Amino acid sequence: TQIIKIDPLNPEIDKIKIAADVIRNGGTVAFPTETVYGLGANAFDGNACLKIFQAKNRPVDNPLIVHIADFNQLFEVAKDIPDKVLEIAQIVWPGPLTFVLKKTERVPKEVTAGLDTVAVRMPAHPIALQLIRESGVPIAAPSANLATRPSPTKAEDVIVDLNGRVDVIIDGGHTFFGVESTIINVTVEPVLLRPGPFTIEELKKLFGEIVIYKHYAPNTRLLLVENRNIFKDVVSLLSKKYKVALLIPKELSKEFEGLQQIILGSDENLYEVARNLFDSFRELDKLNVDLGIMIGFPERGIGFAIMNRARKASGFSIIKAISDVYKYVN
Ligand SMILES: C[C@@H](O)[C@H](NC(=O)OP(=O)(O)OC[C@H]1O[C@@H](n2cnc3c(N)ncnc32)[C@H](O)[C@@H]1O)C(=O)O
Ligand SMILES: [Mg+2]
């Protein structure tokens, strides 16, 4: 694999071209976006897209998102787009919001898992936009992690996972938000399929009527304590019997000094917690602990997405009264 260091805010166009030539030749390129890194191929090339599933060991029926760099490309991959959706797409893109739309005949089965629909977004990241531009094709990509690991948000995550399994990794620094794009299905009348950095507060203003067995990393047991009023007591109860790690904001670090901590960022800046979330799950599994205990965060703004990912990551081990602890541990 060629690892290519490219400045994420002012990318060297000659370096972007090296990766774009790989895309056009049917090869795979991992690249940063504003959400998480993606592992991409030419969205029109179904054999090239199968290489993404081979690199990740991804089940073949989990479909990809097509990333576009302009509106001409939208109409190559999607059709029958309602006028209201088109007008909204023109004000939200580039940005961390993916639309599920009806596909065109040009989109391969490998991209859509055989579905009649295709998920599309225009990524708000200079490296991603310039890669797609220079490639001259939309780029299909899911998150760039190996199957059972958390979505990658910095180059080293992608390197550890995919080095030797993909043609190019673009080392483009840390992604901006750290959690995957919001996904809305606008082929039905519309449903929020995945919360993300494009918040439900903003969505509801644009789409008033919006409707709201996989194992998720980490492999270490992880409990999510939604009720902050019992957190100290859940930690007391469990740290007596287990070697624990606490996933907490920096404001609670002093209260638990002596226990292993993974600091997610500041309670006064949820974007920091979202930026650090998946890497805190990688750290948990590097440590040698019986279990992770994460505290909840407000479900406002990107909080909703943080908590969506945290619930999944915990296998829905949610603690709202301390007696809930019974259900998940001796
Ligand atoms: C690279 C960056 O753009 C990142 N992509 C990513 O994280 O994709 P990822 O979540 O691994 O895979 C694409 C997901 O997008 C959803 N998806 C794709 N096509 C769909 C369709 N036609 N209907 C419903 N959901 C779809 C599925 O949940 C599928 O698992 C992101 O969305 O921010
Ligand atoms: Mg993924």
CSV table of C-alpha atoms and ligand atoms in Angstrom, one decimal:
chain,number,residue,atom,x,y,z
A,1,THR,CA,0.0,0.0,0.0
A,2,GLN,CA,1.3,3.5,-0.8
A,3,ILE,CA,0.7,5.8,2.2
A,4,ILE,CA,0.5,9.4,0.9
A,5,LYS,CA,0.6,12.4,3.3
A,6,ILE,CA,-1.7,15.1,2.1
A,7,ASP,CA,-2.6,18.4,3.8
A,8,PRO,CA,-6.3,18.1,4.6
A,9,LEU,CA,-7.1,21.9,4.5
A,10,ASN,CA,-4.9,22.7,1.4
A,11,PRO,CA,-4.3,19.5,-0.4
A,12,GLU,CA,-1.4,19.2,-2.9
A,13,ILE,CA,-3.2,18.6,-6.2
A,14,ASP,CA,-0.3,16.5,-7.6
A,15,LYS,CA,-0.6,14.1,-4.6
A,16,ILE,CA,-4.4,13.9,-5.0
A,17,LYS,CA,-3.8,13.0,-8.7
A,18,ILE,CA,-1.7,9.9,-7.7
A,19,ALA,CA,-4.7,8.6,-5.7
A,20,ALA,CA,-7.2,9.6,-8.3
A,21,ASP,CA,-5.2,7.6,-11.0
A,22,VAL,CA,-5.7,4.6,-8.7
A,23,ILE,CA,-9.4,5.2,-8.5
A,24,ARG,CA,-9.7,5.4,-12.3
A,25,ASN,CA,-7.7,2.2,-12.7
A,26,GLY,CA,-10.1,0.2,-10.5
A,27,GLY,CA,-8.1,0.3,-7.3
A,28,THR,CA,-8.9,1.2,-3.6
A,29,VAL,CA,-8.1,4.4,-1.8
A,30,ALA,CA,-8.7,5.1,1.9
A,31,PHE,CA,-9.3,8.9,2.4
A,32,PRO,CA,-10.3,11.3,5.2
A,33,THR,CA,-13.7,13.1,5.2
A,34,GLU,CA,-15.3,15.4,7.7
A,35,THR,CA,-17.0,12.3,9.4
A,36,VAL,CA,-14.8,9.3,9.4
A,37,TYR,CA,-12.2,7.9,6.9
A,38,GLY,CA,-13.8,6.1,3.9
A,39,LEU,CA,-12.4,3.2,1.8
A,40,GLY,CA,-13.3,4.1,-1.8
A,41,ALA,CA,-13.5,2.8,-5.4
A,42,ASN,CA,-15.0,4.0,-8.6
A,43,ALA,CA,-18.7,3.8,-7.9
A,44,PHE,CA,-19.4,2.7,-11.5
A,45,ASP,CA,-17.1,-0.2,-11.3
A,46,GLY,CA,-18.7,-3.2,-9.5
A,47,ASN,CA,-15.4,-5.3,-9.5
A,48,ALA,CA,-13.4,-2.5,-8.1
A,49,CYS,CA,-16.1,-2.0,-5.4
A,50,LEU,CA,-16.0,-5.7,-4.4
A,51,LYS,CA,-12.3,-5.0,-3.5
A,52,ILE,CA,-13.6,-2.7,-0.7
A,53,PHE,CA,-15.7,-5.6,0.8
A,54,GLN,CA,-12.6,-7.9,0.4
A,55,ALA,CA,-10.3,-5.4,2.2
A,56,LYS,CA,-12.7,-4.9,5.1
A,57,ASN,CA,-14.2,-8.4,5.2
A,58,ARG,CA,-17.6,-6.8,4.9
A,59,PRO,CA,-20.8,-8.8,4.5
A,60,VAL,CA,-21.7,-8.3,0.9
A,61,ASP,CA,-25.3,-7.1,1.6
A,62,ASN,CA,-24.2,-4.1,3.6
A,63,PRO,CA,-24.4,-1.3,0.9
A,64,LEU,CA,-21.9,1.6,0.3
A,65,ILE,CA,-22.4,5.4,0.2
A,66,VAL,CA,-21.7,7.1,-3.1
A,67,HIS,CA,-19.7,10.3,-2.6
A,68,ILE,CA,-20.1,13.0,-5.3
A,69,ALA,CA,-18.2,16.3,-5.8
A,70,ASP,CA,-20.9,18.1,-7.9
A,71,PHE,CA,-24.5,18.0,-8.9
A,72,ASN,CA,-23.9,16.7,-12.3
A,73,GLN,CA,-22.6,13.5,-10.6
A,74,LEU,CA,-25.8,13.3,-8.4
A,75,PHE,CA,-27.9,12.7,-11.6
A,76,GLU,CA,-25.5,10.0,-12.8
A,77,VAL,CA,-26.3,7.9,-9.7
A,78,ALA,CA,-29.8,8.9,-8.6
A,79,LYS,CA,-33.0,9.8,-10.3
A,80,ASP,CA,-36.7,10.8,-9.6
A,81,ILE,CA,-35.4,13.2,-7.0
A,82,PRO,CA,-38.2,15.3,-5.5
A,83,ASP,CA,-37.9,19.0,-6.3
A,84,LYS,CA,-37.9,19.8,-2.5
A,85,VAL,CA,-35.0,17.3,-1.9
A,86,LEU,CA,-33.0,18.8,-4.8
A,87,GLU,CA,-33.5,22.4,-3.4
A,88,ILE,CA,-32.4,21.2,0.1
A,89,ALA,CA,-29.4,19.2,-1.2
A,90,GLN,CA,-28.1,22.4,-2.8
A,91,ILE,CA,-27.9,24.2,0.7
A,92,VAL,CA,-26.6,21.3,2.8
A,93,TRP,CA,-23.9,19.9,0.5
A,94,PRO,CA,-21.0,19.5,0.9
A,95,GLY,CA,-21.9,18.3,4.4
A,96,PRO,CA,-22.3,15.3,6.7
A,97,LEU,CA,-25.8,14.4,5.5
A,98,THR,CA,-26.5,11.4,3.3
A,99,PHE,CA,-29.8,11.0,1.3
A,100,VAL,CA,-31.2,7.6,0.3
A,101,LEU,CA,-32.6,8.1,-3.2
A,102,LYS,CA,-33.7,6.0,-6.1
A,103,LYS,CA,-30.8,4.6,-8.1
A,104,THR,CA,-30.0,4.8,-11.8
A,105,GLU,CA,-29.1,1.9,-13.9
A,106,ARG,CA,-25.4,2.9,-13.8
A,107,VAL,CA,-25.0,2.0,-10.1
A,108,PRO,CA,-23.6,-1.6,-9.7
A,109,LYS,CA,-25.2,-4.2,-7.5
A,110,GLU,CA,-22.1,-4.2,-5.3
A,111,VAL,CA,-22.7,-0.6,-4.3
A,112,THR,CA,-26.4,-0.9,-3.4
A,113,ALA,CA,-26.5,-4.6,-2.1
A,114,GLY,CA,-29.1,-5.2,-4.9
A,115,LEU,CA,-31.5,-2.5,-3.4
A,116,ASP,CA,-33.5,-0.2,-5.6
A,117,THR,CA,-32.1,2.7,-3.7
A,118,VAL,CA,-28.6,4.4,-3.4
A,119,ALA,CA,-27.2,6.4,-0.5
A,120,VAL,CA,-25.4,9.6,-1.6
A,121,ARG,CA,-23.5,12.4,0.0
A,122,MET,CA,-21.1,15.2,-1.0
A,123,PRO,CA,-18.3,15.2,1.6
A,124,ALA,CA,-17.3,18.5,3.2
A,125,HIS,CA,-13.5,17.8,3.2
A,126,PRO,CA,-11.0,19.2,0.7
A,127,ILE,CA,-9.2,15.9,0.2
A,128,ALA,CA,-12.4,13.9,-0.4
A,129,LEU,CA,-13.8,16.5,-2.7
A,130,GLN,CA,-10.6,17.0,-4.7
A,131,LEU,CA,-10.1,13.2,-4.9
A,132,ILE,CA,-13.5,12.7,-6.4
A,133,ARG,CA,-13.0,15.7,-8.8
A,134,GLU,CA,-9.7,14.5,-10.1
A,135,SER,CA,-11.0,10.9,-10.3
A,136,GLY,CA,-13.9,12.2,-12.5
A,137,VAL,CA,-16.2,9.5,-11.1
A,138,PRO,CA,-18.3,9.3,-7.9
A,139,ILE,CA,-16.6,7.3,-5.3
A,140,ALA,CA,-18.4,4.5,-3.4
A,141,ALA,CA,-17.1,4.1,0.1
A,142,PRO,CA,-18.1,2.7,3.5
A,143,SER,CA,-16.0,3.6,6.7
A,144,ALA,CA,-12.5,2.4,6.3
A,145,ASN,CA,-12.2,0.0,9.3
A,146,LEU,CA,-11.7,-3.7,9.4
A,147,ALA,CA,-15.1,-5.3,10.0
A,148,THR,CA,-15.0,-5.7,13.8
A,149,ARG,CA,-13.2,-2.5,14.7
A,150,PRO,CA,-14.5,1.0,15.3
A,151,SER,CA,-14.8,3.5,12.4
A,152,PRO,CA,-11.4,5.1,11.9
A,153,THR,CA,-11.0,8.8,12.5
A,154,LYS,CA,-7.2,9.3,12.1
A,155,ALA,CA,-4.7,7.9,9.6
A,156,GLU,CA,-3.0,5.5,12.1
A,157,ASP,CA,-6.4,3.7,12.6
A,158,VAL,CA,-6.6,3.1,8.9
A,159,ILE,CA,-3.0,2.0,8.7
A,160,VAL,CA,-3.3,-0.5,11.5
A,161,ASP,CA,-6.5,-1.9,9.9
A,162,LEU,CA,-5.9,-1.8,6.1
A,163,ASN,CA,-2.1,-1.6,5.5
A,164,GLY,CA,-1.3,-4.3,2.9
A,165,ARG,CA,-5.0,-4.7,2.0
A,166,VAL,CA,-5.7,-1.6,-0.1
A,167,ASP,CA,-3.8,0.2,-2.9
A,168,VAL,CA,-3.5,3.7,-1.3
A,169,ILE,CA,-4.0,5.2,2.2
A,170,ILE,CA,-4.2,9.0,2.3
A,171,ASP,CA,-2.8,10.2,5.6
A,172,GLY,CA,-4.9,13.3,5.9
A,173,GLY,CA,-4.9,13.9,9.7
A,174,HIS,CA,-7.9,13.5,12.1
A,175,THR,CA,-11.4,13.7,10.7
A,176,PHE,CA,-13.4,16.8,11.7
A,177,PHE,CA,-16.5,15.3,13.5
A,178,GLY,CA,-15.5,11.7,14.2
A,179,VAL,CA,-18.9,10.1,13.7
A,180,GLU,CA,-20.6,9.0,10.5
A,181,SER,CA,-23.0,11.1,8.4
A,182,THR,CA,-26.6,11.6,9.3
A,183,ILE,CA,-28.7,9.4,6.9
A,184,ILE,CA,-32.2,10.3,5.8
A,185,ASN,CA,-34.4,8.2,3.5
A,186,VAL,CA,-36.2,10.5,1.1
A,187,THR,CA,-37.7,7.8,-1.1
A,188,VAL,CA,-40.6,7.4,1.5
A,189,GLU,CA,-42.8,10.3,2.8
A,190,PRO,CA,-39.0,10.8,5.2
A,191,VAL,CA,-37.2,8.8,7.9
A,192,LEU,CA,-34.0,9.3,9.9
A,193,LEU,CA,-32.0,6.1,9.4
A,194,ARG,CA,-28.9,7.2,11.3
A,195,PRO,CA,-28.2,10.3,13.5
A,196,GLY,CA,-25.0,12.1,12.8
A,197,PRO,CA,-23.3,15.6,12.7
A,198,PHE,CA,-26.2,17.1,10.7
A,199,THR,CA,-28.4,17.4,13.7
A,200,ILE,CA,-32.0,16.4,14.1
A,201,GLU,CA,-32.7,20.1,15.3
A,202,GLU,CA,-31.6,21.3,11.8
A,203,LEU,CA,-33.3,18.4,9.9
A,204,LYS,CA,-36.7,18.9,11.6
A,205,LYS,CA,-36.5,22.6,10.3
A,206,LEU,CA,-36.0,21.3,6.7
A,207,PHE,CA,-38.2,18.2,6.8
A,208,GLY,CA,-40.9,19.0,9.4
A,209,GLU,CA,-42.5,15.6,9.1
A,210,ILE,CA,-39.3,13.6,9.5
A,211,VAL,CA,-39.8,10.2,11.3
A,212,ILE,CA,-37.3,9.4,14.0
A,213,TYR,CA,-27.5,-9.0,15.7
A,214,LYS,CA,-24.4,-7.0,14.7
A,215,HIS,CA,-21.7,-6.8,17.3
A,216,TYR,CA,-20.1,-3.4,17.6
A,217,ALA,CA,-16.7,-2.8,18.9
A,218,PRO,CA,-15.3,-2.7,21.5
A,219,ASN,CA,-14.9,-6.4,22.3
A,220,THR,CA,-14.3,-5.6,25.9
A,221,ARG,CA,-17.7,-5.4,27.8
A,222,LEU,CA,-18.9,-1.7,28.0
A,223,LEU,CA,-21.7,-0.4,30.1
A,224,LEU,CA,-23.3,2.9,29.3
A,225,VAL,CA,-24.6,4.9,32.3
A,226,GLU,CA,-27.2,7.3,31.0
A,227,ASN,CA,-28.2,8.7,34.4
A,228,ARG,CA,-25.3,10.9,35.6
A,229,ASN,CA,-26.8,10.9,39.1
A,230,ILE,CA,-25.8,7.3,39.8
A,231,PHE,CA,-22.4,7.2,38.0
A,232,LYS,CA,-20.2,7.6,41.0
A,233,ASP,CA,-22.1,4.7,42.7
A,234,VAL,CA,-22.0,2.4,39.7
A,235,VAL,CA,-18.2,3.0,39.5
A,236,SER,CA,-17.9,2.2,43.3
A,237,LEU,CA,-20.0,-0.9,43.0
A,238,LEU,CA,-18.1,-2.3,40.0
A,239,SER,CA,-14.4,-1.2,40.6
A,240,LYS,CA,-14.5,-3.2,43.9
A,241,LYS,CA,-15.1,-6.4,41.9
A,242,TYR,CA,-13.6,-5.6,38.5
A,243,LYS,CA,-10.6,-3.9,37.0
A,244,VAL,CA,-12.5,-1.1,35.1
A,245,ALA,CA,-11.8,1.8,32.7
A,246,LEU,CA,-14.0,4.9,32.7
A,247,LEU,CA,-14.9,6.7,29.6
A,248,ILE,CA,-15.6,10.2,30.9
A,249,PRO,CA,-15.3,13.9,30.2
A,250,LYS,CA,-12.3,15.8,31.6
A,251,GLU,CA,-14.5,17.5,34.2
A,252,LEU,CA,-15.1,14.2,36.1
A,253,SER,CA,-11.4,13.1,36.0
A,254,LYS,CA,-10.6,14.4,39.6
A,255,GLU,CA,-13.5,12.4,41.1
A,256,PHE,CA,-12.1,9.1,40.0
A,257,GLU,CA,-8.4,9.6,40.3
A,258,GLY,CA,-6.7,6.2,40.8
A,259,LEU,CA,-8.9,4.4,38.3
A,260,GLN,CA,-8.0,3.9,34.7
A,261,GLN,CA,-9.7,6.7,32.6
A,262,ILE,CA,-10.2,7.4,28.9
A,263,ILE,CA,-10.9,11.1,28.6
A,264,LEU,CA,-13.5,11.8,25.9
A,265,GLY,CA,-13.1,15.6,26.0
A,266,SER,CA,-15.0,18.4,27.7
A,267,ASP,CA,-18.6,18.4,28.8
A,268,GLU,CA,-18.8,22.0,27.3
A,269,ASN,CA,-17.9,20.9,23.8
A,270,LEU,CA,-19.6,17.7,22.6
A,271,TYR,CA,-17.8,17.9,19.2
A,272,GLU,CA,-14.6,17.1,21.1
A,273,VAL,CA,-16.3,14.0,22.7
A,274,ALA,CA,-17.6,12.9,19.2
A,275,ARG,CA,-14.1,13.4,17.7
A,276,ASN,CA,-12.6,11.1,20.3
A,277,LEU,CA,-15.4,8.5,20.7
A,278,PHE,CA,-14.3,5.6,18.4
A,279,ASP,CA,-10.7,5.9,19.3
A,280,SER,CA,-11.6,5.7,23.0
A,281,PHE,CA,-13.2,2.3,22.0
A,282,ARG,CA,-10.0,1.2,20.4
A,283,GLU,CA,-8.1,2.3,23.5
A,284,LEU,CA,-10.4,0.3,25.7
A,285,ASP,CA,-9.5,-2.9,23.9
A,286,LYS,CA,-5.8,-2.1,24.1
A,287,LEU,CA,-6.0,-1.8,27.9
A,288,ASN,CA,-6.2,-4.9,30.0
A,289,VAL,CA,-9.5,-4.4,31.8
A,290,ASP,CA,-12.6,-6.5,32.6
A,291,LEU,CA,-14.9,-3.7,31.5
A,292,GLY,CA,-15.4,-0.2,30.3
A,293,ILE,CA,-17.9,2.1,32.0
A,294,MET,CA,-19.0,5.1,29.9
A,295,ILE,CA,-21.0,8.1,31.2
A,296,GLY,CA,-23.9,9.6,29.2
A,297,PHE,CA,-24.0,12.9,27.5
A,298,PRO,CA,-26.9,15.3,26.6
A,299,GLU,CA,-28.9,14.3,23.6
A,300,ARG,CA,-28.9,17.7,22.0
A,301,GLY,CA,-27.0,18.5,18.7
A,302,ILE,CA,-24.2,15.9,18.0
A,303,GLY,CA,-25.0,14.4,21.5
A,304,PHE,CA,-27.8,12.4,19.9
A,305,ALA,CA,-25.3,10.7,17.5
A,306,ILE,CA,-22.7,10.2,20.3
A,307,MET,CA,-25.3,8.3,22.3
A,308,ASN,CA,-26.6,6.4,19.3
A,309,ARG,CA,-23.1,5.1,18.6
A,310,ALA,CA,-22.5,4.5,22.4
A,311,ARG,CA,-25.6,2.4,22.8
A,312,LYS,CA,-24.6,0.2,19.9
A,313,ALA,CA,-21.1,0.0,21.1
A,314,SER,CA,-22.3,-1.2,24.5
A,315,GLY,CA,-24.5,-3.9,23.1
A,316,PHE,CA,-27.4,-1.9,24.6
A,317,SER,CA,-26.0,-2.3,28.1
A,318,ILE,CA,-27.8,0.8,29.4
A,319,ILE,CA,-27.8,1.8,33.1
A,320,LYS,CA,-30.5,4.2,34.2
A,321,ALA,CA,-31.1,3.0,37.8
A,322,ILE,CA,-28.3,1.3,39.7
A,323,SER,CA,-30.2,-2.0,40.0
A,324,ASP,CA,-29.8,-2.2,36.1
A,325,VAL,CA,-26.2,-3.2,36.8
A,326,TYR,CA,-27.6,-6.7,37.8
A,327,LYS,CA,-28.5,-7.5,34.2
A,328,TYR,CA,-24.9,-7.1,32.7
A,329,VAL,CA,-22.4,-8.2,35.3
A,330,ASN,CA,-21.9,-10.4,38.5
B,1,LIG,C1,-16.9,7.5,4.6
B,1,LIG,C2,-18.0,8.4,5.3
B,1,LIG,O1,-18.7,9.0,4.2
B,1,LIG,C3,-18.9,7.5,6.1
B,1,LIG,N1,-19.4,6.2,5.5
B,1,LIG,C4,-19.7,5.2,6.3
B,1,LIG,O2,-19.5,5.3,7.4
B,1,LIG,O3,-20.4,4.3,5.7
B,1,LIG,P1,-20.7,3.1,6.4
B,1,LIG,O4,-21.8,3.4,7.6
B,1,LIG,O5,-19.6,2.0,6.8
B,1,LIG,O6,-21.6,2.2,5.2
B,1,LIG,C5,-22.7,2.7,4.5
B,1,LIG,C6,-24.0,2.6,5.3
B,1,LIG,O7,-25.0,3.4,4.6
B,1,LIG,C7,-26.3,2.8,4.8
B,1,LIG,N2,-26.8,2.7,3.5
B,1,LIG,C8,-26.2,2.6,2.3
B,1,LIG,N3,-27.0,2.5,1.3
B,1,LIG,C9,-28.3,2.4,1.8
B,1,LIG,C10,-29.7,2.3,1.2
B,1,LIG,N4,-29.9,2.2,-0.1
B,1,LIG,N5,-30.7,2.2,2.1
B,1,LIG,C11,-30.5,2.4,3.5
B,1,LIG,N6,-29.2,2.5,4.0
B,1,LIG,C12,-28.1,2.6,3.3
B,1,LIG,C13,-26.1,1.5,5.4
B,1,LIG,O8,-26.3,1.6,6.9
B,1,LIG,C14,-24.6,1.2,5.3
B,1,LIG,O9,-24.2,0.3,6.3
B,1,LIG,C15,-20.1,8.4,6.5
B,1,LIG,O10,-21.3,8.1,6.1
B,1,LIG,O11,-19.9,9.5,7.0
B,2,MG,MG,-19.0,1.2,8.8
